[PDB]
């Protein structure tokens, strides 16, 4: 909670909203990328007959 703090009405708190949004976006990036690499490692590997 550095996000909800009482700030004067300006573009500053707008950018705090932006940065918290990007923080949540990186959280989502992590939670997809981790499972993505997990399936990438664990999956079968193509071969010759």
């Amino acid at each position: 909670r550095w996000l909800e703090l009482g700030l004067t009405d300006e573009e500053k708190q707008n950018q705090l909203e932006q940065l918290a949004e990007q923080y949540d976006e990186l959280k989502h990036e992590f939670e997809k990328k981790l499972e993505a690499k997990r399936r990438k490692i664990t999956q079968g590997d193509d071969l010759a007959p």
Binding site: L3, E4, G6, L7, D9, Q13, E17, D24
Partner: protein
């Protein structure tokens, strides 16, 4: 009538805008008035509304031969927060069609056609939308803007100001702050309207000119206190939601004592069915409830009570009639009492022992002492002639048109 929103205290939905627009007209036409009457209930009296100066700056007028660009006025309609609908049905909605810009305003009963020309207002032409065909020309329009409430960029910013003064904010996109920061409209926004104003919301009393009158019926303070308690109960019950945060009920509505302190400012006539003591400024004017004269069809005489009422009475008996299609039913019975009235529309034409009637849906008959006037209604006769209200004037369930539409 100043109708209300007809929602829950701390509701979660949107009231029907049209009567709101109608109330807006009332808001448009309250500190301008010279006779006539508005009614309000106290729960409707507690909504403290945006200033008439705000309205007056926002509500504007176009004229018949006025030099105006189409997209210029359309930009003013964006300033009005008018809603772009391809097929417009209600207020604050607009459609683009050639030089024609169709819009249904939130003042009027009826929508408008503009057809501009060479930076110029050519036409101003109105129609029924379900007809979708021209009805008549007018040379002028006062267009009230699409909401009572500003939703412009400055409005959104200062909303965000007062919001982050008051409430908490989350990263959740379903936060009220979040959609208003996106500039879209919440369902239950209408309680959060104080967020637009540095000042507290002016009461309708603030709108009141000098020549207004206040008329009371009942200890309406008590009903107000009940509504305060009920709405306060909603202030705890709904005041647990992190997803819809609740303003102070003080910040929306006035309290009863301070209310009565502004009620000091205008003369007020109070009404009690109960008889008064003989203190000063007590009137107790000469009126009695007429005794019951219902139809007793099972015996020979449904009408003898009516009869012995009639010959002990000594004045005009006037009959409230719901419709002319009601009245022959009256005649159906009025031949049975040998006596039939003369239809009138003016009350004070009545004279001694005259039987008269008016088309009117009135509740109950009475006895007037001063002019000695009897009056007769349908609820006194055919039992409770009650009308079950399915919905309000504007909206209802649509079993016929909608599924066809």
């Amino acid at each position: 009538n100043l109708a209300d929103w007809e929602t829950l205290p701390y509701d979660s939905f949107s009231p029907h805008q049209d009567i709101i627009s109608s109330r807006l007209s009332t808001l448009y036409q309250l500190p301008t008035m010279q006779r006539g009457v508005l009614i309000v209930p106290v729960n409707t009296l507690m909504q403290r509304v945006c200033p008439h100066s705000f309205l007056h700056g926002h509500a504007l007028v176009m004229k018949k031969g006025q030099r105006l660009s189409r997209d210029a006025l359309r930009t003013q309609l964006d300033s009005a927060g008018y809603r772009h609908v391809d097929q417009v049905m209600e207020h604050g909605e607009y459609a683009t069609r050639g030089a024609l810009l169709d819009l249904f305003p939130m003042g009027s009963e009826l929508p408008y056609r503009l057809d501009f020309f060479d930076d110029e207002i050519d036409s101003l032409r109105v129609f029924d939308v379900d007809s979708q065909r021209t009805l008549e020309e007018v040379e002028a329009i006062n267009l009230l803007p699409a909401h009572e409430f500003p939703t412009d960029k400055a409005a959104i910013e200062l909303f965000r100001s007062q919001w982050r003064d008051t409430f908490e904010v989350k990263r959740d996109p379903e936060h009220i702050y979040q959609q208003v920061s996106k500039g879209t409209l919440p369902a239950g926004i209408e309680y959060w309207q104080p967020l637009f104003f540095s000042e507290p919301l002016p009461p309708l009393f603030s709108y009141f000119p000098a020549n207004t009158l206040l008329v009371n019926t009942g200890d309406l303070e008590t009903s107000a206190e009940r509504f305060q308690a009920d709405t306060l109960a909603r202030f705890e019950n709904r005041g647990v939601d992190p997803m819809r945060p609740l303003l102070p009920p003080q910040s929306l509505w006035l309290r009863v004592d301070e209310l009565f302190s502004e009620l000091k400012n205008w003369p007020r006539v109070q009404l009690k069915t109960e008889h008064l003591p003989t203190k000063a400024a007590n009137a107790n004017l000469g009126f009695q409830k007429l005794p019951d004269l219902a139809v007793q069809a099972q015996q020979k005489a449904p009408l003898d009570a009516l009869r012995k009422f009639l010959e002990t009475f000594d004045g005009p008996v006037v009959f409230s009639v719901e419709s002319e299609g009601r009245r022959e039913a009256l005649g159906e019975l009025l031949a049975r009492i040998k006596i039939a009235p003369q239809r009138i529309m003016r009350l004070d034409e009545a004279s001694d022992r005259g039987r008269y009637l008016m088309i009117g849906a009135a509740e109950h008959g009475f006895v007037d002492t001063v002019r000695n006037l009897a009056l007769i209604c349908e609820s006194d006769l055919l039992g409770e002639r009650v009308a079950r209200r399915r919905q309000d004037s504007r909206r209802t369930i649509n079993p016929d048109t909608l599924i066809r539409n």
